[PDB]
Amino acid sequence: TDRFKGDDDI
């Protein structure tokens, strides 16, 4: 799913 998107914030 993520393509260098970075981990989502809280």
Partner 1 sequence: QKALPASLVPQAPPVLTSKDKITKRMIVVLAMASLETHKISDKYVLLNCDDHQGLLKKMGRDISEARPDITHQCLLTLLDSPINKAGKLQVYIQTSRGILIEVNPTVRIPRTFKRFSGLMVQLLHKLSIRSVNSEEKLLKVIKNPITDHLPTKCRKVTLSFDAPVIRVQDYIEKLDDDESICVFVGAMARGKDNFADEYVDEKVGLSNYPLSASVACSKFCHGAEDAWNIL
* Residues lying near partner 1 in the complex (CB under 8 A): 2-7, 9
Question: How far is 10 from 6, CA to CA, in rounded Å?
Answer: 13
